[PDB]
């Protein structure tokens, strides 16, 4: 199947509603890519809001904002999956699972652009 924008979102919808703690590593690795690709569909301005929401929902302290925002920033600017590969190599499986699930559940509810002019205009078009 073609990885269109719609397919990408439907794939995210689907995996957001799964318990991924027992899935094989090959699929977990692919989910990391999904999070990376999906992160890049947010404007740069929305990454702090992504971080703040991640912290709030996961019950993390403000001292965790630096590393969490860094993950989102470095995925957003990732070239050739270099940073993505580093996360896979250097984090334990439990950390990856928790970050991935957290992201997939927040990503579909946050706006992907921040300009009021963009948001207000697009709302007039929604059925």
């Amino acid at each position: 199947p073609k990885i269109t924008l719609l397919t990408l979102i439907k794939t995210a919808e689907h995996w957001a509603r799964q318990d991924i703690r027992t899935i094989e590593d090959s699929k977990l690795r692919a989910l990391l890519t999904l999070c990376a690709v999906m992160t890049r569909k947010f404007s740069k301005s929305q990454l702090s809001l992504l971080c703040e929401t991640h912290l709030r929902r996961e019950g993390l302290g403000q001292d965790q904002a630096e590393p969490v925002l860094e993950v989102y920033q470095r995925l957003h600017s990732d070239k050739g999956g270099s940073f993505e590969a580093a996360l896979w190599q250097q984090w334990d499986r439990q950390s990856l699972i928790m970050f991935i699930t957290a992201f997939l559940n927040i990503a579909l509810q946050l706006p992907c652009e921040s300009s009021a002019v963009v948001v207000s205009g697009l709302r007039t078009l929604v059925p």
């Binding site: 993950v71 580093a86 190599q89 250097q90 984090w91 928790m98 970050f99």
Partner: peptide, 11 residues
Amino acid sequence: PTVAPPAPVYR
């Protein structure tokens, strides 16, 4: 390749 940041600590 690079050096990843630390994973989030739950507490």
